[PDB]
Amino acid sequence: SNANYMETGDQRFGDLVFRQLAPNVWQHTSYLDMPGFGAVASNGLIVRDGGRVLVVDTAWTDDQTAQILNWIKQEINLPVALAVVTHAHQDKMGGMDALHAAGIATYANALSNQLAPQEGMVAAQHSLTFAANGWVEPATAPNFGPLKVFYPGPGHTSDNITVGIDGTDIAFGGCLIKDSKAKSLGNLGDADTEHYAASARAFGAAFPKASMIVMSHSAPDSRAAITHTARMADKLR
Ligand SMILES: [Cl-]
Numbered sequence: 001s002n003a004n005y006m007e008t009g010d011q012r013f014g015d016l017v018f019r020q021l022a023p024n025v026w027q028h029t030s031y032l033d034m035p036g037f038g039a040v041a042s043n044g045l046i047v048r049d050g051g052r053v054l055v056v057d058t059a060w061t062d063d064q065t066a067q068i069l070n071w072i073k074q075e076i077n078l079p080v081a082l083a084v085v086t087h088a089h090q091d092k093m094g095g096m097d098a099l100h101a102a103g104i105a106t107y108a109n110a111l112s113n114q115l116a117p118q119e120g121m122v123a124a125q126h127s128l129t130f131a132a133n134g135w136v137e138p139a140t141a142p143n144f145g146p147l148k149v150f151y152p153g154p155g156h157t158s159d160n161i162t163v164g165i166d167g168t169d170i171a172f173g174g175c176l177i178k179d180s181k182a183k184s185l186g187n188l189g190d191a192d193t194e195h196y197a198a199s200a201r202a203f204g205a206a207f208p209k210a211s212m213i214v215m216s217h218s219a220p221d222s223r224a225a226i227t228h229t230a231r232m233a234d235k236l237r
Pocket residue numbers: 175185186187216217
């Protein structure tokens with residue numbers, strides 16, 4: 001349960017893995033086997049804000065996403081107010097149904113909702129919209145607490161968004177940022193290779209105080225993950 005700094009190690013629950021990040025923040029992790037590679041991790045976040053819990057990124061599947069809700073009931077014992085999912089893809093949207101069944105309000109980039117059916121995903125219930133500088137329109141993100149939503153520009157996909165957690169110095173780059181040892185940009189099937197670099201860089205500028213970068217396929221890293229990701233993307237153009 002990691003109650004204090006002398007109880008450590010990731011918590012295994014079902015097939016899921018949870019790692020505490022800051023006092024109110026955890027990374028949730030699920031796995032799906034992929035041709036030729038094998039098991040691939042997909043990370044998302046759980047934020048405790050006051051008397052509610054906020055989730056970013058469901059798991060790969062409905063039944064894994066259900067497990068996440070269960071773990072929250074056991075370990076945090078708080079209601080889940082809302083969830084924000086970061087683009088329409090199985091790794092971040094696979095479990096929308098489970099969130100919905102649980103009666104949990106869901107939010108995504110309007111564009112992610114427009115693409116969901118074509119990407120084989122269930123759309124979120126609410127749509128976020130963004131200014132030209134990339135920050136979310138606050139009226140579209142009511143009651144987001146510490147979550148600061150930023151759309152960096154096309155990237156891993158054209159709809160990808162990102163989230164800072166105010167006060168924790170943690171920024172979630174999702175599929176857009178890779179860690180500093182990464183050998184490639186991962187899955188580019190949907191990517192905008194022209195704007196990727198600028199988008200990665202825009203993310204770094206949106207959260208200039210983040211000391212912890214959380215991404216989809218790897219353990220959290222330093223800001224060196226932004227820099228390195230941008231250099232890799234520079235090679236795309
Ligand atoms: Cl990826």
